[PDB]
Amino acid sequence: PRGSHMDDALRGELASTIQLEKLSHPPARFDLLTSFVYKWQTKAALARKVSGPMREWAAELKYRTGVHIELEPTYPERLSENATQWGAYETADDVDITVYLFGSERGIFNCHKLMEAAIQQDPVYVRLGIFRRLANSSEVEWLMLRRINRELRPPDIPPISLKLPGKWTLLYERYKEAAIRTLWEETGITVDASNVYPTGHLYQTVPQYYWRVPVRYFVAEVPSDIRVEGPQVVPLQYMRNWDARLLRQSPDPIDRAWAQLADPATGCAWMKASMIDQLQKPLRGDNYMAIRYTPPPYSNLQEVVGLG
Ligand SMILES: Nc1nc2c(ncn2[C@@H]2O[C@H](COP(=O)(O)OP(=O)(O)O)[C@@H](O)[C@H]2O)c(=O)[nH]1
């Protein structure tokens, strides 16, 4: 019942081999979905590529074929263990996951080959660090957004995410291609692929959070004078039309900094790296921007951005 609701929410933002096993009927726990049902016994290293933290790719597979993807840890009691067929999993990739498919065999056949191609790639989150240089200052300003995540979310996703632009790679989409397209979807800024530079990737997960995906990072300079329109895809899902008087007095530092630098008409804000890491210091430690958005030397840009 929760899996469907999350797939319905992503509909607005949508525009070596797999051994399936047909099941006579589904287990009683999955009858409400029941329409055939096929099972795929795999690991989280593979099942993560057809689901996603917010069911990004499980919803696209439904948008494509009409099949419903349902995932469950095969032996979830092992995820409650600290220290073999039983005990704590070594890594998240090793977590046994059982995937269920619901729909017509026509739609299941289409999704099956889509899934066999999905598990071949590396689907990740992308963040294109958009920055501009200030004539009066020496440091750069980065464009920040605050997305209001939905109620149906995994426990590792906050209610509001202070983020730089960027979403996720669609099925068969590539890193830079996703970073540029998702940049416009969240900001409305058009950046050329020759000015986008990869700055690194991060993957930190635990077995209990088997769904977590790597994050590929990019940076690109924007002209200091530019019309930042804000989110054009699902704009209601971002912090907008807020009230600067009362939020300025919120006990959250993010919130106060948002009331002072954010524009409620666009939901966007320009922040310096020293300000972003100060905001991320109590949650992430030091060097939040430097760890993620340090340009490669061939960009001839780590001099300009200031992290280096
Ligand atoms: N949000 C999110 N973060 C992840 C996921 N998987 C890994 N991470 C970690 O997120 C850290 C950096 O996150 P950040 O750049 O602040 O993006 P954000 O956490 O999604 O706002 C990295 O150390 C990654 O290991 C995921 O599926 N979702």
Numbering used by the authors: 331 to 345, 406 to 424, 426 to 474, 486 to 710
Sentences from the paper on this structure:
The 5′ ends are processed by a pyrophosphohydrolase complex termed the PPsome, which is composed of the so-called mitochondrial edited mRNA stability factors 1–3 (MERS1–MERS3). MERS1 was shown to be the factor responsible for catalyzing the 5′ processing event while MERS2 and MERS3 activates its catalysis. Interestingly, the MERS1 Nudix motif (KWTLLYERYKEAAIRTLWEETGI) lacks one of the key metal ion coordinating acidic residues, which in MERS1 is a threonine instead of an acidic residue. The MERS1 structure reveals that it is comprised of two α−β domains.
Crystals of the MERS1-GTP complex were obtained first and the structure was solved by multiple-wavelength anomalous diffraction (MAD) using a selenomethionine-substituted crystal. The structure was refined to final Rwork/Rfree values of 22.9%/25.7% to 2.45 Å resolution. Density for the nucleotide was evident in the MERS1–GTP structure, wedged into a pocket at the interface between the MERS1 domains. The GTP γ phosphate electron density is weak hence, we constructed the nucleotide as GDP. There are extensive interactions between MERS1 residues and the GDP in this binding site that effectively lock it in place. Lys235 from the Nudix motif makes electrostatic interactions with the GDP phosphate groups. A number of other MERS1 residues contact the GDP phosphate moieties including Arg199, Arg356, and Arg364 as well as tyrosine residues, Tyr289, Tyr360, and Tyr365. In addition, the side chain of Arg284 makes cation-π interactions with the guanine base. Interestingly, clear electron density in the MERS1-GTP structure was observed for an extra helix docked between the two domains of MERS1, next to the Nudix motif. Our discovery of the fortuitously bound helix in the MERS1–GTP structure, which inserts an acidic residue close to the Nudix motif, could explain how MERS2 binding activates MERS1 activity if this residue can substitute for the missing acidic residue in the MERS1 Nudix motif and possibly contributes to magnesium binding, for example.
